[PDB]
Amino acid sequence: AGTAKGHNPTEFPTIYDASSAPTAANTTVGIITIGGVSQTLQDLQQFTSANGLASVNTQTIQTGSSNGDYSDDQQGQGEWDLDSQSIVGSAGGAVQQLLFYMADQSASGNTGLTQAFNQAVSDNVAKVINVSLGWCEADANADGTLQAEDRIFATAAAQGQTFSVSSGDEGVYECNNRGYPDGSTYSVSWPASSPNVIAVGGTTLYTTSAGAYSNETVWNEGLDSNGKLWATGGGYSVYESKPSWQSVVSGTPGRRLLPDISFDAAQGTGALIYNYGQLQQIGGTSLASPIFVGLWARLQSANSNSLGFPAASFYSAISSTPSLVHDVKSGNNGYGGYGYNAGTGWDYPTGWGSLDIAKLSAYIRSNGF
Ligand SMILES: [Ca+2]
Ligand SMILES: [Cl-]
């Protein structure tokens, strides 16, 4: 029902019932990037100015060597643009500060990215940090990246910071050359599979003619011209054990199940983003995660930044309180009859579904989080 169309980031508060919440003006938000953000900061200025918003206070942080390579990755600017504009829109147009934690591009292995995570945790200034990135968890495990980075995320959670991590864009086929159909062989992304982050999957978002929420289905846009699947990542880690709050999803393996929650990701229902000055309609779970980050930062500002890492509370609250979410029920995250199916309650494509922010805010006021 409803219509599939692109959306300005300033629409996400209306869509996810956040208009009545404070903005994130009292919460600092981080974004992990690969390389520099010089064009992204110009695109952010275009965004805030076009939408008549107060300018956003930004900082850029070289997280690795002094002599590292923090040049702009040109294609990457569109990703940091998606992240930053979607955060600020979802946040209601205001964040206290946006911190870009830039990974060194000339560091060995995945150590530039690991150092960017590390800096965000060590500084402990951002309450919420967006990670619109990932790759096959088995590859991360094989070279020690998984173990090194999980230590950092564990410190974050203990400090009360929320890392939000996109679940992936390959459906169940993350490890098959990043999204080529592979029958019944299913896999998941890192760092989404960490139990120390909030993993965010993807929906197809339908709105009414007045722009209200109508419905969400699983994000699955099928194959591109290369034969690669575009769909929400979801499944379970082969390595990470199930954190005990996930026990409420009965009949699942003893592994970290993902995603936790989901928001808009279909390109066909995606965000209108300024990229090198030009408006483009962009999706991915790289959209869904920044939507969560901006919305969650509103709830942090409503609660004096006192909400800790929220995974356990999400699973207890939502399992007991279905009115807190839009439960996705239709669609699949594979191809050719394979993959996981959405269904009643928690499912592998979408987790609990999307948050109804004003309802969650009322729950937190009554019950804490
Ligand atoms: Ca569901
Ligand atoms: Cl845990």
**Structural domain count of the chain:** 1
d(CA 284, CA 242): 26
The tokens of 350 are what? 């979408």
Angle at 135 between CA 39 and CA 224, to 5 degrees: 80
Cis upstream peptide for 310 (omega within 30°)? no
Q: What is the resolution of this structure in A?
A: 1.1
Q: Pairing mode, if any, of strands 198-207 and 261-264?
A: parallel
Q: Which of 193, 199, 214, 201 is nearest to 164 (CA)?
A: 199
Residue-range definition of the domain harbouring residue 189: 1-369
Q: Which ligand is nearest to the CA of 352?
A: 1
Domain CATH number, residue 12: 3.40.50.200
Distances (CA, A) of 238 to 21, 25, 126: 38, 39, 30
CB contact at 8 A, 166 and 131: yes
d(CA 155, CA 231): 31
Q: Which two tokens stand for residue 291?
A: 């939507």
325 CA distance to ligand 1 centroid (A)?
A: 10
CA of 308 to the centre of ligand 2 (A): 14
* Token pair for 209: 């003619």
Q: How many residues does the chain have?
A: 369
Tokens coding 121: 């945790």
For residues 136 and 168, what is the distance between their CA atoms, to the nearest angstrom?
9
Token representation of residue 366: 């009554």
For tokens 């495990």, the residue is: 141
Experimental determination approach used: X-ray
Q: Two tokens at 47?
A: 């965004």
Q: Which residues are annotated as a binding site for Ca(2+)?
A: 327-328, 343, 345, 347
Ligand nearest to the CA of 249: 1
Read off the DSSP letter of residue 36.
B
Question: Beta 325-326 vs 271-275: how paired, if at all?
Answer: unpaired
